[PDB]
Each structure stands twice: as structure tokens, then as C-alpha cells.
Amino acid sequence: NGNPFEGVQLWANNYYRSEVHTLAIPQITDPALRAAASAVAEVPSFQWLDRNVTVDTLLVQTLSEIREANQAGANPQYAAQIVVYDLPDRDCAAAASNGEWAIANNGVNNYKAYINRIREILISFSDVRTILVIEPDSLANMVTNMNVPKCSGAASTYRELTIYALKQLDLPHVAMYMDAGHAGWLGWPANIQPAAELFAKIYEDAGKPRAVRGLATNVANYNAWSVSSPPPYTSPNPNYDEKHYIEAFRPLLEARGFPAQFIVDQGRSGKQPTGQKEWGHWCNAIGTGFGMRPTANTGHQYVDAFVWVKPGGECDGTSDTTAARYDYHCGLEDALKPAPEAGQWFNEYFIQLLRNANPPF
Numbered sequence: 001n002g003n004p005f006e007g008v009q010l011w012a013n014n015y016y017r018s019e020v021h022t023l024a025i026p027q028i029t030d031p032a033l034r035a036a037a038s039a040v041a042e043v044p045s046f047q048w049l050d051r052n053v054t055v056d057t058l059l060v061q062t063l064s065e066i067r068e069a070n071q072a073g074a075n076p077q078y079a080a081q082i083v084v085y086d087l088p089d090r091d092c093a094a095a096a097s098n099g100e101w102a103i104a105n106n107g108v109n110n111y112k113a114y115i116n117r118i119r120e121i122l123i124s125f126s127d128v129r130t131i132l133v134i135e136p137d138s139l140a141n142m143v144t145n146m147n148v149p150k151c152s153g154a155a156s157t158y159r160e161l162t163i164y165a166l167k168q169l170d171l172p173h174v175a176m177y178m179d180a181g182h183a184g185w186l187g188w189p190a191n192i193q194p195a196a197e198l199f200a201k202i203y204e205d206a207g208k209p210r211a212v213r214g215l216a217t218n219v220a221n222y223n224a225w226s227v228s229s230p231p232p233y234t235s236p237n238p239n240y241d242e243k244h245y246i247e248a249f250r251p252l253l254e255a256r257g258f259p260a261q262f263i264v265d266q267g268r269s270g271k272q273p274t275g276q277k278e279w280g281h282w283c284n285a286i287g288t289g290f291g292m293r294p295t296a297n298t299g300h301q302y303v304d305a306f307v308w309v310k311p312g313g314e315c316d317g318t319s320d321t322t323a324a325r326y327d328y329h330c331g332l333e334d335a336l337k338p339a340p341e342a343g344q345w346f347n348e349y350f351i352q353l354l355r356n357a358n359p360p361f
């Protein structure tokens with residue numbers, strides 16, 4: 001079917017614009033950086049439904065604004081970009097982004113109701129083309145972290161709820177992309193076949209919903225789409241950038257009946273190599289910059305578009321060792337500190353991304 005990024009304009013949401021203008025710009029002293037910051041507020045990054053309260057507030061508000069714009073004659077029409085991110089026992093292999101719901105406290109029923117309400121809302125807004133990224137990190141943890149107690153404990157629930165979401169959100173105007181980790185996680189030659197088996201089986205078990213378009217890679221990470229030599233921290237993985245990963249991964253998925261198209265996050269991929277000391281250091285990484293802007297013109301048959309899924313400037317996790325959600329990755333030498341709770345605005349990190357932007361603002 002169709003590439004959902006073709007023939008539309010991507011709406012830049014007002015939540016991210018509001019962070020930049022109300023929190024970042026007033027604290028930025030230099031004129032050029034203020035002007036740069038205003039420009040990055042217009043880059044259309046995904047809007048995250050990270051908490052249940054966002055469904056009837058922020059989601060409805062964004063879809064309503066788009067409808068008004070399109071009903072006025074926007075050309076091309078705008079499309080929404082939304083992330084579904086509220087699994088019970090969320091972020092199973094880390095502490096920083098633990099969610100509001102727990103499997104031991106009716107999390108499965110809370111999640112099904114959240115999905116059902118999202119579905120009702122998307123049905124009401126069927127006139128708005130909606131692109132969704134389904135639960136970043138969830139299935140990638142199923143592949144490599146079955147040795148982690150929280151992840152093995154949540155495995156059967158993650159599989160059931162993913163299938164539930166793929167079926168309930170399989171709507172005419174919706175395109176879904178399942179999160180598929182990244183080059184440095186599932187792109188390792190040892191992990192790529194097992195990842196292809198898992199994604200292709202979930203797709204099959206969901207009844208191969210027509211709205212599932214493929215997979216999203218590099219969400220909330222910093223990998224290059226394509227570099228000319230391997231960054232030192234990538235060795236010895238031969239799939240050292242997303243282009244290598246996706247070129248190796250698509251054949252294995254298509255072999256198992258899932259001919260997935262991809263979308264690749266590049267919101268924090270502008271500077272390479274990054275300042276990461278190890279490829280697994282994912283929290284508030286130093287030496288990173290805003291990367292390639294969202295576009296359907298990728299020059300690749302398997303890639304629907306480059307996107308900005310993780311909104312740069314929104315924290316990856318607190319550096320406070322007394323916090324409930326403290327994760328040691330956020331206290332590393334290559335993690336920017338001090339840092340606020342995951343998802344809260346981190347001005348010093350936003351300025352790092354601005355200064356290191358490529359292309360520049």
C-alpha cells in the first residue's frame with residue numbers, strides 16, 4: 001500500500017513548541033541560538049501518549065487543530081504523528097522511564113481500556129491521516145532481556161497487549177510501525193534473525209492487520225543513518241549504522257511473511273561519532289546534535305521516511321541517585337547532568353543539540 005508520509009505535510013505539535021518557547025527561549029541569552037531554537041520548534045516530531053491523561057486532552061487537541069487546518073484547505077493536508085507508550089511494567093530493563101501502570105495492579109485491563117479509548121478517538125478523527133509508533137523498546141527487550149526479571153515477568157503480557165493494540169488500531173486512515181530497537185541493539189548479527197522471527201510472528205498472530213506498515217528504528221537513540229566508517233563504540237558489529245541494519249533486516253522479515261517498510265529516528269543523530277563511550281549508553285548522551293530533518297525523500301526503497309520520534313530536549317532520565325526512577329546509565333560519565341525526570345524539559349541538553357545540529361539551524 002501507500003507510504004503514509006507521501007502526499008501530506010507533517011504537523012508540528014504545539015506541546016513541543018510550547019516547551020521551546022516557554023521554557024527554552026526565555027533562558028537562552030544569545031540572539032542566534034534564540035532564533036535557532038524558534039526554528040527547531042517547527043520541526044515536526046512525534047507526540048507521545050506517555051500517560052493516560054494525554055488521551056482525552058493532548059491527543060484530541062492535536063487532532064482537532066489538524067482537522068481545522070485541513071478543513072480550511074491546507075495543501076498538502078496535514079498528518080498526525082503519535083507514539084503509543086504506556087504498557088504496564090513499561091521500560092522493563094531500565095528504571096528511568098517506568099510508567100504509571102503495573103501488571104500486578106490491573107495494568108493489563110488499564111492498558112486495554114487506554115487502547116480502546118485511543119481507537120474511539122481515532123475513529124472520530126478518521127479524516128485525519130494518523131501515523132503511529134507502537135511502544136518503543138518493548139519487543140526489543142523481549143529479544144535480548146529475557147534474563148531480566150521484570151522483562152521475563154512481562155513477556156506474555158507484552159505479547160498479548162501488542163497484538164491487542166495492532167488489532168484495535170487497525171483503522172483505514174492509520175499507519176502503524178512497531179518499534180524495532182536499533183542497529184546497536186537488534187542489528188548485531190547474533191540478534192537479527194531472532195528479532196525477525198519475533199516481529200514476523202507477532203504480525204502473523206495479529207492476523208496481519210492491513211494498517212501495519214512496518215517498523216521504526218533508532219527511536220530515542222543516536223545512531224547514524226549512514227556513515228562512511230564505523231564509530232569506535234560500534235565494534236565489532238558490522239551493522240554500525242541504521243542503513244546497514246535495515247538492509248540486513250528486511251530480507252529476514254520478508255522471508256517470514258512481513259515485508260516491513262521502515263521509519264528511522266534521526267532527531268539526535270546529527271553529530272557522529274557521538275560522545276558515547278559504549279554503544280549501550282543511551283541516557284542523555286553527550287556529544288550529540290539534532291540530525292536529518294523529517295522527510296519522505298530518503299532515497300531508499302525500504303525506508304518510508306526519516307522522522308524525529310524522540311523530541312530532543314525531553315530528558316531520558318533523572319541523574320538523581322535518590323530518585324525512585326534513577327537508572328545508573330543516567331549517572332555515567334557520558335550522560336549530561338544534572339538531569340531531570342525522563343520526559344521533562346532539559347534545557348542544557350536542548351542547547352547541546354542545537355549547537356551540534358547538522359544540518360545547522
Ligand SMILES: OC[C@H]1O[C@@H](O[C@H]2[C@H](O)[C@@H](O)[C@H](O[C@H]3[C@H](O)[C@@H](O)[C@H](O[C@H]4[C@H](O)[C@@H](O)[C@H](O)O[C@@H]4CO)O[C@@H]3CO)O[C@@H]2CO)[C@H](O)[C@@H](O)[C@@H]1O
Pocket residue numbers: 091093094097137144145182184185186188190191219220221279280281282
Ligand atoms: O535506545 C533506547 C533504549 O535503550 C535501552 O537500552 C538498550 C540499548 O539502547 C542497546 O544499545 C543495548 O544493546 C545491547 C544488546 O541488547 C546486546 O544484545 C548486545 O550484545 C552484544 C555485545 O555488545 C557484544 O560485546 C557481543 O559480542 O555480542 C553481543 C550480541 O550477541 O549489546 C548491545 C550494546 O552494544 O540494549 C539495551 C537494553 O539492554 C534502554 O533500556 C531504554 O530505556 C532506552 O529507551
Ligand SMILES: *[C@@H]1O[C@H](CO)[C@@H](O)[C@H](O)[C@H]1NC(C)=O
Pocket residue numbers: 052053055056110114117
Ligand atoms: C484513563 O483515562 C480515561 C479517559 O480518557 C479515564 O476514563 C480512565 O479512568 C483512565 N484510566 C485509569 C486507569 O485511570
Ligand SMILES: OC[C@H]1O[C@@H](O)[C@H](O)[C@@H](O)[C@@H]1O
Pocket residue numbers: 048050096097310311314315316342343344
Ligand atoms: O520525550 C519522549 C518520551 O521519552 C520517554 O523517555 C519518557 O519516559 C516519556 O515521558 C516521554 O514522553
